[PDB]
Amino acid sequence: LKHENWPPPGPPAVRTFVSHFGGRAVSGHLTRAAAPLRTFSVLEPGGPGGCSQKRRATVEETAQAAACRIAQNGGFFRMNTGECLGNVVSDGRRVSSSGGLQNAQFGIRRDGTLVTGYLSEEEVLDTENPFVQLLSGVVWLIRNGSIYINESQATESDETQETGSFSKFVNVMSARTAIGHDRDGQLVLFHADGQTEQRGINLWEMAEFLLRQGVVNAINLDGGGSATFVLNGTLASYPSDHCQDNMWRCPRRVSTVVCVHEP
Amino acid sequence: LKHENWPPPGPPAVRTFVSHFGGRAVSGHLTRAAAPLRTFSVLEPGGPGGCSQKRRATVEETAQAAACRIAQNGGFFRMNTGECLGNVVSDGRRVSSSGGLQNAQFGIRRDGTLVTGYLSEEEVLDTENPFVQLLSGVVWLIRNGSIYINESQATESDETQETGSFSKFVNVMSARTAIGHDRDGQLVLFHADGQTEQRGINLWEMAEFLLRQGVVNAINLDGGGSATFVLNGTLASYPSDHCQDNMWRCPRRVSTVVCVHEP
Numbered sequence: 001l002k003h004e005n006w007p008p009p010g011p012p013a014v015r016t017f018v019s020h021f022g023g024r025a026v027s028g029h030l031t032r033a034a035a036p037l038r039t040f041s042v043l044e045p046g047g048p049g050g051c052s053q054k055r056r057a058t059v060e061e062t063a064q065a066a067a068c069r070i071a072q073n074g075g076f077f078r079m080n081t082g083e084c085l086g087n088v089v090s091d092g093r094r095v096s097s098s099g100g101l102q103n104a105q106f107g108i109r110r111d112g113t114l115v116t117g118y119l120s121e122e123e124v125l126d127t128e129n130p131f132v133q134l135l136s137g138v139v140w141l142i143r144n145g146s147i148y149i150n151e152s153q154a155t156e157s158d159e160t161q162e163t164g165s166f167s168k169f170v171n172v173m174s175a176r177t178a179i180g181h182d183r184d185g186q187l188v189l190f191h192a193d194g195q196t197e198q199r200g201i202n203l204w205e206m207a208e209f210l211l212r213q214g215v216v217n218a219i220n221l222d223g224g225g226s227a228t229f230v231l232n233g234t235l236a237s238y239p240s241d242h243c244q245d246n247m248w249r250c251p252r253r254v255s256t257v258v259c260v261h262e263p
Numbered sequence: 264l265k266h267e268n269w270p271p272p273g274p275p276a277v278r279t280f281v282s283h284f285g286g287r288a289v290s291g292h293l294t295r296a297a298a299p300l301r302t303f304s305v306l307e308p309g310g311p312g313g314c315s316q317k318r319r320a321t322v323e324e325t326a327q328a329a330a331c332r333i334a335q336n337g338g339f340f341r342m343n344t345g346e347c348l349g350n351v352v353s354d355g356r357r358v359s360s361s362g363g364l365q366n367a368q369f370g371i372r373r374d375g376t377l378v379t380g381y382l383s384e385e386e387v388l389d390t391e392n393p394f395v396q397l398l399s400g401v402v403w404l405i406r407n408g409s410i411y412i413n414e415s416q417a418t419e420s421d422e423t424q425e426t427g428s429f430s431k432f433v434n435v436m437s438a439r440t441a442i443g444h445d446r447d448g449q450l451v452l453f454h455a456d457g458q459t460e461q462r463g464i465n466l467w468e469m470a471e472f473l474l475r476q477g478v479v480n481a482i483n484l485d486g487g488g489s490a491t492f493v494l495n496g497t498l499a500s501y502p503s504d505h506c507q508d509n510m511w512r513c514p515r516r517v518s519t520v521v522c523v524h525e526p
């Protein structure tokens with residue numbers, strides 16, 4: 001009712017793009033990975049226990065301990081405290097709660113079922129077919145093959161992102177990332193390089209792009225300076241944050257990470 | 264007095280930028296590596312013997328065989344035949360000739376002397392202090408701390424690059440790459456993502472950027488679709504060529520490669 005369940009039924013395919021959104025050229029990658037139950041992980045910052053310690057680490061640091069073939073930044077977090085925000089299940093271990101808020105979620109149950117959308121506390125704690133991986137974003141981009149941004153603005157909590165108003169967060173140009181799946185049950189990761197209010201895409205544009213790629217459900221993960229794409233442990237994107245006291249670009253220390261590893 | 268000699272004076276510094284050239288945001292990397300006599304190699308495509316066999320291989324393929332920490336596409340080539348163009352010396356092995364043409368060159372001799380500029384056949388074939396690495400480009404960007412593109416346009420042969428007229432090659436927007444060195448004798452590698460006549464920079468813009476980073480000599484290497492940046496064997500740039508029959512971007516099979524590796 002409030003979420004989509006996809007029953008469960010080959011190295012990941014990493015695609016590089018430079019595409020035009022509203023006339024602007026935006027670079028990024030689309031990753032497609034089969035057998036998510038075997039290859040998909042949600043990782044805590046700096047290894048197990050990171051969310052409890054409120055640790056912040058770069059996607060590179062977190063991914064290299066896990067030997068991820070493809071890693072991207074994960075959920076939203078409080079920059080000043082390192083608190084993980086939203087429900088998180090990391091390799092069977094629940095390490096973050098929604099705190100009453102309703103936000104877009106994506107995860108996989110123990111039998112391989114992919115779940116996307118708004119989950120109650122009871123659904124998250126279900127011991128029957130428990131979640132093995134789960135994280136929260138902000139805005140349910142695609143529901144059952146249709147854009148669901150209008151509905152997200154109407155119903156989703158707006159206490160997690162710090163970009164500004166919900167409308168600005170939805171419509172501003174920025175770096176963006178998203179997670180979802182296609183109709184064959186393959187995991188889909190997306191990222192686009194950008195910089196808030198300067199370069200990149202908004203959520204309407206990302207949702208259209210993903211529908212073209214066959215995505216049937218997907219949520220928006222952390223963007224802006226948090227957006228990071230790490231390929232075999234190497235940074236392969238252009239972060240927007242500047243390094244300290246110079247104008248070079250530097251990857252942000254973030255919280256949870258989404259990982260695709262070998263089965 | 265047609266070339267410059269720089270006497271021999273930590274891991275390499277890899278920096279990411281997104282920088283603005285006339286209001287266009289251009290992304291790329293600047294690499295700086297010490298002790299080039301021990302850490303810098305020019306590689307033949309695929310493996311040793313690539314030039315004699317007219318091999319074309321991606322920078323990734325060529326670099327994974329050499330264990331490069333940083334790799335970029337090298338000199339110019341003929342796409343239809345795979346012929347290596349210009350003088351090439353790869354770890355002491357001479358594998359390509361100038362054919363009488365005059366083009367910007369960059370090399371290091373056995374004692375560590377860094378050499379940039381125009382070289383006679385006698386200088387290339389010298390055996391007293393022989394070249395251990397050497398490759399040729401098109402346009403001498405910076406000579407002893409001053410831009411030298413006007414002089415290069417005045418003197419360099421124009422039979423190697425296939426972009427079009429000399430003026431277009433210099434002034435057109437595109438993906439670009441460059442090799443040079445700073446006054447501490449360190450190797451500098453530069454690349455900017457782009458697409459000929461759509462995105463990127465021209466040679467004047469790249470030359471101005473390199474001067475601000477302390478580059479005292481540099482030449483222009485193969486740009487356009489050839490431009491590739493590979494870090495620890497993983498592609499970390501956005502090539503402009505499309506893959507066969509789809510919207511995704513694919514690295515180009517190129518010729519010689521410039522490599523920074525362990526000493």
Ligand SMILES: O=P(O)(O)OC[C@H]1O[C@H](O)[C@@H](O)[C@@H](O)[C@@H]1O
Pocket residue numbers: 163174195196223224225226240
């Ligand atoms: O991640 P974004 O969208 O680029 O925002 C990053 C910026 O947000 C606000 O301006 C501040 O909190 C700054 O710390 C930061 O420069």
Ligand SMILES: O=P(O)(O)OC[C@H]1O[C@H](O)[C@@H](O)[C@@H](O)[C@@H]1O
Pocket residue numbers: 426437458459486487488489503504
């Ligand atoms: O490396 P570049 O600059 O992108 O050039 C690639 C292009 O060169 C030529 O002009 C044409 O044959 C094009 O069809 C080709 O795609």
Ligand SMILES: CC(=O)N[C@@H]1[C@@H](O)[C@H](O)[C@@H](CO)O[C@@H]1O
Pocket residue numbers: 075076077078079160161162163174175196221222223224225226
């Ligand atoms: C465009 C975008 O998503 N920016 C996000 C912001 O919303 C979020 O509050 C913060 C920490 O999670 O990271 C980034 O700044």
Ligand SMILES: CC(=O)N[C@@H]1[C@@H](O)[C@H](O)[C@@H](CO)O[C@@H]1O
Pocket residue numbers: 338339340341342423424425426432437438459484485486487488489
């Ligand atoms: C703008 C630019 O660098 N273009 C080059 C072209 O000049 C060269 O002829 C070809 C093969 O080396 O590769 C790229 O297309």
